[PDB]
Amino acid sequence: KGFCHAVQRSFIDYKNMILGTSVNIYEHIGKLQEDIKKIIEKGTPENVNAWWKGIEREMWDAVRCAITKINKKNNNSIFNGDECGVSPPTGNDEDQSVSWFKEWGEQFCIERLRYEQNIREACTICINSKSGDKIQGACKRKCEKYKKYISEKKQEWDKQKTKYENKYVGKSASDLLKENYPECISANFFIFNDNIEYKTYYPYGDYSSICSCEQVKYYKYNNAEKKNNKSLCYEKDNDMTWSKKYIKKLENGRSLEGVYVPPRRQQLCLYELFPIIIKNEEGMEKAKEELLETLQIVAEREAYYLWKQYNPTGKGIDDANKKACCAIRGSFYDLEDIIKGNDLVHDEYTKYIDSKLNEIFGSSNTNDIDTKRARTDWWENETTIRQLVWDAMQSGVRYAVEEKNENFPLCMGVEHIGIAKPQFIRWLEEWTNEFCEKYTKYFEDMKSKCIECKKACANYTNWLNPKRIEWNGMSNYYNKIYRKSNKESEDGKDYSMIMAPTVIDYLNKRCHGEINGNYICCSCKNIGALDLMNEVLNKMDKKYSAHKMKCTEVYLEHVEEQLNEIDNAIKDYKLGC
Amino acid sequence: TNEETCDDRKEYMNQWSCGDNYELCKYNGVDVKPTTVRSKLDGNDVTFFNLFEQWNKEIQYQIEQYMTNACKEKCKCYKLWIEKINDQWGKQKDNYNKFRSKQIYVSLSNFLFFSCWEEYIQKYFNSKIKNIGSDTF
């Protein structure tokens, strides 16, 4: 196993060492490369590259001859060029850094699996604990060795990953390692936690599992004591944009686009589910109460974080509270969807979560739709789960209220709520809401400034520019899926429940009213005087035409000066007692 | 021939069309009304150039889905859009040269370089102030 891989690594190392590049691993490489260059550039005249390209085929033939003859001398069947690659490896990823990073990740995954197996063997006899049940002899020492190993791998991986990301900005190392080697899909780069709490509250980070046994139960709002910041994750952001990636590809011919992750959804706290799931790997179909406790914990924590961070952002207590209620409603809807697995995001978190849920609910041969139905009815069943989560969210929001010393908002105060719309509609309406808010802020700021609003106009136009492609995207997606009674629908979602041949009609008739937490969550008027924003998308509207000349003149001036800056910068980038 | 059998494939959707005074380019079924406020840059002329700007953007965006493009019908549609984009780019270059002629007092090379680096500076940064990469250069 892993033999022809080593052959490829060695061949790449020789190829990149025979000619002068960033190689200094040996006691010296510069001496050998300098001697090679001096020998080459005396008869051949660069010429080193031509000589290497000439001899590469012979070298590959030589290694093929070597493997063929070594298996010939072996008593087994004589092999041939059947080794991985009849040709030398291609130049797409011949960089030393890429290969070294890949091999480092592969061996890290293999050793992590080995440590997991060792822990499972040595800590299988919480359960069968011998005692404050922290003393075990072998289990504790093994997970401590794992702790130190992770401690050093933290800085190692940090350095290697930051170097790779700087070299190839626009990609991700974690996804590359996941796709190259399927041996570690359970890997979650959280093992290298930076927070001190994740190092002291979690004695072993990702392995606060079986090596540590406490069986701490969640404490409801009636309990004065809390989880004492068991999963005190970082607060979410408020000024970050959407994402066009992480969408499942049904096929290359279709390649559906125009769907974007809302800013609130992509900032979600779901850290604590992974370690508890790893701990409860054993005990299938009997630890679902622990899963319920953990999801109540995470829902309460995220609701408290959202209310703590969003409420101060805006002194309009009424509409800010209504918007926060709508946001937590949408968060609950998304949580319910991911409980039933009816979302489109396919990151390392959601993929692992859905795999675990499928292997838990699916006994031996239940169909995918059967598993969807089973998890849906289990979520709707009462012991309802979507009443326990609602009470947990209410507990979190009330904790936020008593921390902020305010009143209980009327919104979300109802103990029961109806079935929500498909997540695409919710994303579209919240996108319209945030676009309206941003437009009202930016246009008002630009009008207030004006003589000096050129910077304000630049901010307004660079905020407006990305919105055109967004609008085109979801308009095109809506025009291809609207009014389909689940027979010819693109997905399993029951479409055709919106009576709107066009998106403009539904956005006009949808939330042109109160911004409260019940169904309708928008408050926008005097914008068209609702449909004029398209004419504002391109720079021909009457409202913008007042400042258009000044804005384009200052934009051209900035273009010229920044052009001068960038060209001079790229010219400058040539290089006892 | 293949135009009707290929438009229904809803894969290309070349919305922009440049069609005499300035060779106006129309993004979609929206009329163009020049709001003049005013031999250098003046009046609605710059507005025309402004329109071209958005076209330029989607042109780059075009390549995106065309990077997702990959039998006989596919090849025919591929050549068809190649010809369309070629003629549209030629017309846009010609009307840009006309704009430059009316803007004698930025040469389709420095300006396009600035725009394609503005793409980079806007995708991640905002940030058009510092150049301290030294590895991404």
Chain A residue closest in CA terms to B33: A540
Among A566, A572, A574, A575, the residue to mutate for chain B (most B Cβ within 10 A) = A566
CB contact (8 A) between residue A570 and residue B137: yes
Q: What does the DSSP 8-state code read for residue A243?
A: B
Q: What distance in Å separates the CA atoms of residue A426 and residue A109, rounded to the nearest whole number? A: 39
Q: What distance in Å separates the CA atoms of residue B21 and residue B95, rounded to the nearest whole number? A: 9
Q: Mark which residues 362-401 of A lie under 8 Å from B by CB.
A: none
Name residue B17's beta-bridge partners.
B26
Chain A residue closest in CA terms to B49: A552
Residue type, A522: C
**Side-chain half-sphere exposure of A107, counting CA atoms within 13 A:** 10
Chain A residue closest in CA terms to B70: A252
Enclosing H/E stretch for A289: helix A288-310
Name residue A182's beta-bridge partners.
none
Q: What distance in Å separates the CA atoms of residue A94 and residue A23, rounded to the nearest whole number? A: 13
CB A485 within 8 A of CB A496: yes
Among A267, A299, A495, A308, residue whose Cα is nearest residue A379:
A299
Give backbone dihedrals phi and psi of A518, rounded to 5 degrees, phi first. -95, 105
Name residue A261's beta-bridge partners.
A243
Enclosing H/E stretch for A71: helix A47-73
Q: What distance in Å separates the CA atoms of residue A367 and residue A358, rounded to the nearest whole number? A: 10
Using CA atoms, how far residue A353 sits from A283, A340, A416, in Å, is 17, 11, 27
Distance of CA A395 to the CA centre of its chain: 28
Q: What distance in Å separates the CA atoms of residue A35 and residue A12, rounded to the nearest whole number? A: 20
**Cα dihedral B1/B6/B12/B15 (nearest 10):** 60
Q: What distance in Å separates the CA atoms of residue A450 and residue A426, rounded to the nearest whole number? A: 36
How many CB atoms sit inside 10 A of residue A165's CB? 14
Helix (H, G, I), strand (E, B) or coil at A247: strand
Contacts of A396 (CB under 8 A, 6+ apart): A299, A300, A301, A302, A303, A304, A307
Among the partner residues B27, B46, B117, nearest to A552 by beta-carbon distance: B46
CB contact (8 A) between residue A563 and residue B110: yes
How many CB atoms sit inside 10 A of residue A470's CB? 16
Resolution of this deposited model, Å: 3.6
Helix (H, G, I), strand (E, B) or coil at A261: strand
- B85: tokens are 């984009």
CB B131 within 8 A of CB A569: yes
Helix (H, G, I), strand (E, B) or coil at A280: coil
Chain A residue closest in CA terms to B68: A252
Among A459, A470, A539, A567, the residue to mutate for chain B (most B Cβ within 10 A) = A539
Q: What distance in Å separates the CA atoms of residue A109 and residue A411, rounded to the nearest whole number? A: 48
Gap from B112 CA to chain A (nearest CA, Å): 10
Among A559, A567, A571, the residue to mutate for chain B (most B Cβ within 10 A) = A559
Among B86, B87, B85, residue whose Cα is nearest residue B65:
B85
Name residue A247's beta-bridge partners.
A345
Chain B residue closest in CA terms to A537: B54
Concatenating the DSSP letter of every residue in B63-74 gives HHHHHT---HHH
CB B95 within 8 A of CB B52: yes
Query: Which residues in A lie closer than 8 A to residue B116 (C-beta atoms)?
Result: none
Query: Which residues in B lie closer than 8 A to residue A561 (C-beta atoms)?
Result: none
CB contact (8 A) between residue B111 and residue A559: yes
Q: Packing angle between helix A317-339 and helix A368-380, nearest 10 degrees?
A: 130
Q: What is the 3-state secondary structure (H, E, C) of A477-546?
A: HHHCCCCCCCCCCCCCCCCCCCCCCCHHHHHHHHCCCCCCCCCCCCCCCCCCCCCCHHHHHCCCCHHHHC
Among the partner residues A538, A542, A563, nearest to B27 by beta-carbon distance: A538
Determine contact: A167 vs chain B, CB below 8 A: yes
Q: What is the 3-state secondary structure (H, E, C) of A339-383?
A: HCCCCCECCHHHHHHHHHHHHHHCCCCCCHHHHHHHHHHHHHCCC
Q: Packing angle between helix A454-479 and helix A548-572, nearest 10 degrees?
A: 100
Token pair 């599992």 in the structure block, residue: A209
Among A297, A308, A275, residue whose Cα is nearest residue A226:
A297
Among A545, A553, A557, A568, the residue to mutate for chain B (most B Cβ within 10 A) = A545
How many CB atoms sit inside 10 A of residue A406's CB? 13
Q: What distance in Å separates the CA atoms of residue B50 and residue A26, rounded to the nearest whole number? A: 57
Chain A residue closest in CA terms to B65: A255
Identify residues of B whose CB sits under 8 angstroms from chain A CBs: 10-11, 13, 27, 30, 32-35, 37-38, 41, 46-47, 50-51, 54, 57-58, 61, 65, 68, 70, 106, 110-111, 113-114, 117, 122, 124, 128, 131, 133, 135-137
Using CA atoms, how far residue A398 sits from A220, A253, A407, A409, in Å, is 12, 50, 9, 10
A279-316: string of b/e by CB count within 10 Å (b at 16+)? bbeeeeeebbebbbbbbbbbbbbbbbbbbbbbbeeeee
The angle formed by the CA atoms of residues A313, A316 and A317, to the nearest 5 degrees, is 90
Q: What distance in Å separates the CA atoms of residue A126 and residue A213, rounded to the nearest whole number? A: 5
CB contact (8 A) between residue B37 and residue A570: no
Contacts of A216 (CB under 8 A, 6+ apart): A227, A230
Gap from B90 CA to chain A (nearest CA, Å): 23
The angle formed by the CA atoms of residues A398, A403 and A406, to the nearest 5 degrees, is 70
Determine contact: A575 vs chain B, CB below 8 A: no
CB B47 within 8 A of CB B60: no
Give backbone dihedrals phi and psi of A211, rounded to 5 degrees, phi first. -60, -25
What's the full length of chain B, in residues?
137
Q: What distance in Å separates the CA atoms of residue A296 and residue A258, rounded to the nearest whole number? A: 33
Gap from A286 CA to chain B (nearest CA, Å): 46
Name residue B26's beta-bridge partners.
B17
Contacts of A315 (CB under 8 A, 6+ apart): none
